[PDB]
Amino acid sequence: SMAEMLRRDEGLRLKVYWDTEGYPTIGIGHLIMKQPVRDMAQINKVLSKQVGREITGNPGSITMEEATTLFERDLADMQRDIKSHSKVGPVWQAVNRSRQMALENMAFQMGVGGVAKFNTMLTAMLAGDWEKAYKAGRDSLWYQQTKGRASRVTMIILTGNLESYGV
Amino acid sequence: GYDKDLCEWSMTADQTEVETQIEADIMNIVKRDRPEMKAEVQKQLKSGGVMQYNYVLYCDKNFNNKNIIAEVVGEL
């Protein structure tokens, strides 16, 4: 499932942390704000609206159930946007579920617009040229910056199964 | 691996304390098993982050922490 896949790749936090670009994050890779904001009063205010109850603390916490709710909403927003995208959508419809999960994993990490930048990879996947797709994904700066996760994801694209996640 | 104490703590403690512990566990496993991967692991932790490994390291009984090196840098 995507929940077990993204829990592994994104970790699980019940208290805010800041990602490598400085953005406040919580749960399973849930971006609270798309600014590099350190203001806890601002962070708490936004997170309170997102989970449905007043968050206090420096930092405050959410419950495990709130983390799951945030993830389920995040995953649906992404899945909705990946099918509708004019470039990524056609590829998603043409590949099997394992490979859809690989594209959804990338979209969760970098956004659909980020996935849309892999023109050579996506063109190769639509053509069924999995070796060229694999090589294009591992040629990228994304592979150099998050090599463990990108190795797992590109291996799905190459092989068509989920063995790189132990499945 | 699973450790009840480290699991909940890594989910809730201050980020700097948690990432100090995560990096220490990872680097200790690198030095024990694959010392030549030290520079690559350090590079990957800086460019890719370290918080995300809290679940596999402390919350997942089915993940063998010896495999954390390949989790950070890819298949060996």
GROMACS .gro file of C-alpha atoms in nm:
model
  243
    1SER     CA    1   0.000   0.000   0.000
    2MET     CA    2   0.104   0.363  -0.044
    3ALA     CA    3   0.072   0.426   0.331
    4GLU     CA    4   0.333   0.164   0.421
    5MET     CA    5   0.555   0.275   0.131
    6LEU     CA    6   0.542   0.644   0.220
    7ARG     CA    7   0.569   0.582   0.595
    8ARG     CA    8   0.896   0.404   0.522
    9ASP     CA    9   1.028   0.672   0.286
   10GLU     CA   10   0.901   0.982   0.476
   11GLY     CA   11   0.920   0.876   0.840
   12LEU     CA   12   0.656   0.946   1.103
   13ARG     CA   13   0.651   1.255   1.327
   14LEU     CA   14   0.392   1.368   1.581
   15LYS     CA   15   0.580   1.695   1.638
   16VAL     CA   16   0.690   1.952   1.380
   17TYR     CA   17   1.031   1.929   1.216
   18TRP     CA   18   1.188   2.133   0.936
   19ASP     CA   19   1.291   1.961   0.615
   20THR     CA   20   1.614   2.018   0.423
   21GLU     CA   21   1.466   2.328   0.256
   22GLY     CA   22   1.349   2.469   0.590
   23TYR     CA   23   0.983   2.385   0.559
   24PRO     CA   24   0.779   2.288   0.868
   25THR     CA   25   0.669   1.926   0.834
   26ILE     CA   26   0.475   1.677   1.046
   27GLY     CA   27   0.311   1.335   1.017
   28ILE     CA   28   0.410   1.135   0.710
   29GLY     CA   29   0.572   1.409   0.504
   30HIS     CA   30   0.287   1.657   0.553
   31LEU     CA   31   0.399   2.008   0.459
   32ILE     CA   32   0.231   2.243   0.707
   33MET     CA   33   0.336   2.558   0.520
   34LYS     CA   34   0.518   2.602   0.189
   35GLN     CA   35   0.735   2.878   0.340
   36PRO     CA   36   1.054   2.839   0.543
   37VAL     CA   37   0.865   2.970   0.846
   38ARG     CA   38   0.998   2.919   1.198
   39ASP     CA   39   0.719   3.120   1.367
   40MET     CA   40   0.549   2.868   1.596
   41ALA     CA   41   0.239   3.085   1.643
   42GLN     CA   42   0.194   3.094   1.266
   43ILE     CA   43   0.270   2.722   1.232
   44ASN     CA   44   0.025   2.630   1.509
   45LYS     CA   45  -0.246   2.850   1.358
   46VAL     CA   46  -0.220   2.682   1.017
   47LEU     CA   47  -0.186   2.329   1.157
   48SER     CA   48  -0.490   2.388   1.380
   49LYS     CA   49  -0.706   2.457   1.074
   50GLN     CA   50  -0.561   2.156   0.892
   51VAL     CA   51  -0.633   1.900   1.168
   52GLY     CA   52  -0.951   2.057   1.308
   53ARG     CA   53  -0.847   2.145   1.664
   54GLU     CA   54  -0.632   2.397   1.851
   55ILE     CA   55  -0.264   2.300   1.858
   56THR     CA   56  -0.055   2.457   2.135
   57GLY     CA   57   0.308   2.409   2.229
   58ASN     CA   58   0.658   2.506   2.112
   59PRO     CA   59   0.642   2.276   1.943
   60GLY     CA   60   0.301   2.116   1.983
   61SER     CA   61   0.196   1.767   1.885
   62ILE     CA   62  -0.071   1.590   1.685
   63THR     CA   63  -0.212   1.245   1.754
   64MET     CA   64  -0.143   0.931   1.553
   65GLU     CA   65  -0.500   0.950   1.423
   66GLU     CA   66  -0.444   1.308   1.308
   67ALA     CA   67  -0.123   1.207   1.130
   68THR     CA   68  -0.316   0.935   0.946
   69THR     CA   69  -0.595   1.176   0.852
   70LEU     CA   70  -0.346   1.430   0.716
   71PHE     CA   71  -0.173   1.157   0.516
   72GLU     CA   72  -0.496   1.023   0.367
   73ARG     CA   73  -0.594   1.373   0.254
   74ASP     CA   74  -0.243   1.441   0.118
   75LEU     CA   75  -0.241   1.110  -0.070
   76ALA     CA   76  -0.581   1.173  -0.231
   77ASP     CA   77  -0.487   1.527  -0.338
   78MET     CA   78  -0.173   1.388  -0.502
   79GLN     CA   79  -0.349   1.093  -0.666
   80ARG     CA   80  -0.616   1.332  -0.795
   81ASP     CA   81  -0.351   1.564  -0.940
   82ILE     CA   82  -0.134   1.292  -1.093
   83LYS     CA   83  -0.415   1.151  -1.310
   84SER     CA   84  -0.532   1.495  -1.422
   85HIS     CA   85  -0.188   1.619  -1.528
   86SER     CA   86  -0.162   1.653  -1.905
   87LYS     CA   87   0.187   1.497  -1.921
   88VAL     CA   88   0.213   1.265  -1.619
   89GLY     CA   89  -0.148   1.146  -1.642
   90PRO     CA   90  -0.113   0.954  -1.970
   91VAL     CA   91   0.194   0.770  -1.838
   92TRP     CA   92   0.019   0.680  -1.512
   93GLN     CA   93  -0.276   0.530  -1.702
   94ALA     CA   94  -0.048   0.322  -1.925
   95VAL     CA   95   0.170   0.148  -1.662
   96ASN     CA   96   0.090  -0.119  -1.402
   97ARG     CA   97   0.002  -0.059  -1.037
   98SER     CA   98   0.359  -0.102  -0.908
   99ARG     CA   99   0.483   0.161  -1.153
  100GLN     CA  100   0.190   0.389  -1.070
  101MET     CA  101   0.305   0.358  -0.708
  102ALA     CA  102   0.655   0.463  -0.814
  103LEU     CA  103   0.523   0.778  -0.983
  104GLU     CA  104   0.294   0.852  -0.688
  105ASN     CA  105   0.593   0.816  -0.455
  106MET     CA  106   0.787   1.070  -0.662
  107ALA     CA  107   0.487   1.304  -0.677
  108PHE     CA  108   0.449   1.285  -0.298
  109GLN     CA  109   0.815   1.384  -0.258
  110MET     CA  110   0.849   1.651  -0.528
  111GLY     CA  111   0.499   1.734  -0.654
  112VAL     CA  112   0.342   1.645  -0.987
  113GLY     CA  113   0.515   1.943  -1.147
  114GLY     CA  114   0.845   1.801  -1.027
  115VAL     CA  115   0.766   1.463  -1.182
  116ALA     CA  116   0.670   1.641  -1.505
  117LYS     CA  117   1.033   1.755  -1.539
  118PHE     CA  118   1.145   1.395  -1.609
  119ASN     CA  119   1.057   1.418  -1.978
  120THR     CA  120   1.301   1.149  -2.094
  121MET     CA  121   1.197   0.911  -1.815
  122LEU     CA  122   0.824   0.960  -1.877
  123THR     CA  123   0.858   0.933  -2.255
  124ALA     CA  124   1.049   0.608  -2.208
  125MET     CA  125   0.792   0.465  -1.966
  126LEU     CA  126   0.511   0.535  -2.212
  127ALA     CA  127   0.715   0.353  -2.478
  128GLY     CA  128   0.782   0.056  -2.247
  129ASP     CA  129   1.159   0.118  -2.259
  130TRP     CA  130   1.217   0.042  -1.893
  131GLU     CA  131   1.597   0.038  -1.923
  132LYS     CA  132   1.598   0.389  -2.070
  133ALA     CA  133   1.350   0.501  -1.803
  134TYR     CA  134   1.568   0.354  -1.526
  135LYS     CA  135   1.879   0.521  -1.669
  136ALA     CA  136   1.702   0.856  -1.703
  137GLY     CA  137   1.581   0.848  -1.343
  138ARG     CA  138   1.925   0.760  -1.207
  139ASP     CA  139   2.093   1.024  -1.426
  140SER     CA  140   1.900   1.297  -1.243
  141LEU     CA  141   2.005   1.527  -0.961
  142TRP     CA  142   1.710   1.383  -0.766
  143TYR     CA  143   1.897   1.052  -0.766
  144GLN     CA  144   2.215   1.221  -0.638
  145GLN     CA  145   2.034   1.409  -0.358
  146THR     CA  146   1.803   1.132  -0.226
  147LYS     CA  147   1.988   0.828  -0.354
  148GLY     CA  148   1.839   0.558  -0.129
  149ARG     CA  149   1.479   0.649  -0.206
  150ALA     CA  150   1.551   0.712  -0.576
  151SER     CA  151   1.721   0.373  -0.603
  152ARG     CA  152   1.411   0.203  -0.461
  153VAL     CA  153   1.176   0.398  -0.687
  154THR     CA  154   1.372   0.361  -1.012
  155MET     CA  155   1.404  -0.013  -0.944
  156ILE     CA  156   1.023  -0.037  -0.950
  157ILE     CA  157   1.024   0.147  -1.283
  158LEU     CA  158   1.283  -0.095  -1.423
  159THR     CA  159   1.141  -0.423  -1.292
  160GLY     CA  160   0.767  -0.358  -1.269
  161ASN     CA  161   0.734  -0.506  -0.918
  162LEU     CA  162   0.772  -0.389  -0.558
  163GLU     CA  163   1.060  -0.613  -0.450
  164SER     CA  164   1.281  -0.308  -0.388
  165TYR     CA  165   1.044  -0.233  -0.098
  166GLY     CA  166   1.061  -0.594   0.025
  167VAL     CA  167   0.720  -0.667  -0.129
  168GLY     CA  168   1.397  -0.235   1.410
  169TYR     CA  169   1.148  -0.171   1.690
  170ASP     CA  170   1.221  -0.008   2.025
  171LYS     CA  171   0.922   0.126   2.220
  172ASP     CA  172   1.128   0.391   2.400
  173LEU     CA  173   1.304   0.519   2.087
  174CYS     CA  174   0.993   0.488   1.869
  175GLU     CA  175   0.768   0.727   2.062
  176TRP     CA  176   1.061   0.953   2.154
  177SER     CA  177   1.174   0.992   1.792
  178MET     CA  178   0.815   1.081   1.696
  179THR     CA  179   0.780   1.351   1.963
  180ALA     CA  180   1.116   1.487   2.081
  181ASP     CA  181   1.289   1.800   1.951
  182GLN     CA  182   1.421   1.754   1.597
  183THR     CA  183   1.787   1.825   1.678
  184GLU     CA  184   1.800   1.564   1.956
  185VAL     CA  185   1.627   1.304   1.737
  186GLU     CA  186   1.850   1.365   1.435
  187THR     CA  187   2.162   1.344   1.652
  188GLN     CA  188   2.048   0.999   1.767
  189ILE     CA  189   1.947   0.882   1.417
  190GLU     CA  190   2.274   0.994   1.259
  191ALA     CA  191   2.470   0.830   1.542
  192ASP     CA  192   2.293   0.496   1.495
  193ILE     CA  193   2.342   0.510   1.117
  194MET     CA  194   2.710   0.606   1.136
  195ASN     CA  195   2.778   0.337   1.398
  196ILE     CA  196   2.630   0.077   1.162
  197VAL     CA  197   2.835   0.215   0.872
  198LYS     CA  198   3.158   0.191   1.072
  199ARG     CA  199   3.070  -0.161   1.189
  200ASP     CA  200   2.967  -0.308   0.853
  201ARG     CA  201   3.073  -0.086   0.558
  202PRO     CA  202   3.326   0.175   0.675
  203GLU     CA  203   3.405   0.281   0.316
  204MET     CA  204   3.046   0.408   0.278
  205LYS     CA  205   3.100   0.678   0.542
  206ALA     CA  206   3.156   0.968   0.301
  207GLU     CA  207   2.859   0.870   0.083
  208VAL     CA  208   2.628   0.827   0.384
  209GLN     CA  209   2.729   1.168   0.521
  210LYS     CA  210   2.669   1.328   0.182
  211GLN     CA  211   2.325   1.165   0.153
  212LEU     CA  212   2.221   1.267   0.505
  213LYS     CA  213   2.310   1.630   0.428
  214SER     CA  214   2.142   1.646   0.087
  215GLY     CA  215   1.849   1.414   0.162
  216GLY     CA  216   1.779   1.464   0.532
  217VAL     CA  217   1.789   1.234   0.832
  218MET     CA  218   1.451   1.256   1.011
  219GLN     CA  219   1.274   1.026   0.765
  220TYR     CA  220   1.460   0.716   0.888
  221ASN     CA  221   1.301   0.724   1.234
  222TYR     CA  222   1.026   0.480   1.136
  223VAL     CA  223   1.243   0.205   0.985
  224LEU     CA  224   1.506   0.235   1.258
  225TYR     CA  225   1.284   0.246   1.568
  226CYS     CA  226   0.920   0.176   1.474
  227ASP     CA  227   0.939  -0.122   1.236
  228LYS     CA  228   0.999  -0.470   1.377
  229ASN     CA  229   1.022  -0.606   1.019
  230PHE     CA  230   1.310  -0.376   0.915
  231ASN     CA  231   1.659  -0.507   0.990
  232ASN     CA  232   1.870  -0.204   1.080
  233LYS     CA  233   2.178  -0.357   0.915
  234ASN     CA  234   1.999  -0.258   0.592
  235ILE     CA  235   1.997   0.111   0.689
  236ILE     CA  236   2.309   0.172   0.478
  237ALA     CA  237   2.130   0.063   0.159
  238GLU     CA  238   1.825   0.260   0.277
  239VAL     CA  239   2.033   0.580   0.271
  240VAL     CA  240   2.259   0.528  -0.034
  241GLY     CA  241   2.079   0.262  -0.239
  242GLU     CA  242   2.141  -0.104  -0.310
  243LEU     CA  243   2.495  -0.224  -0.240
   0.00000   0.00000   0.00000
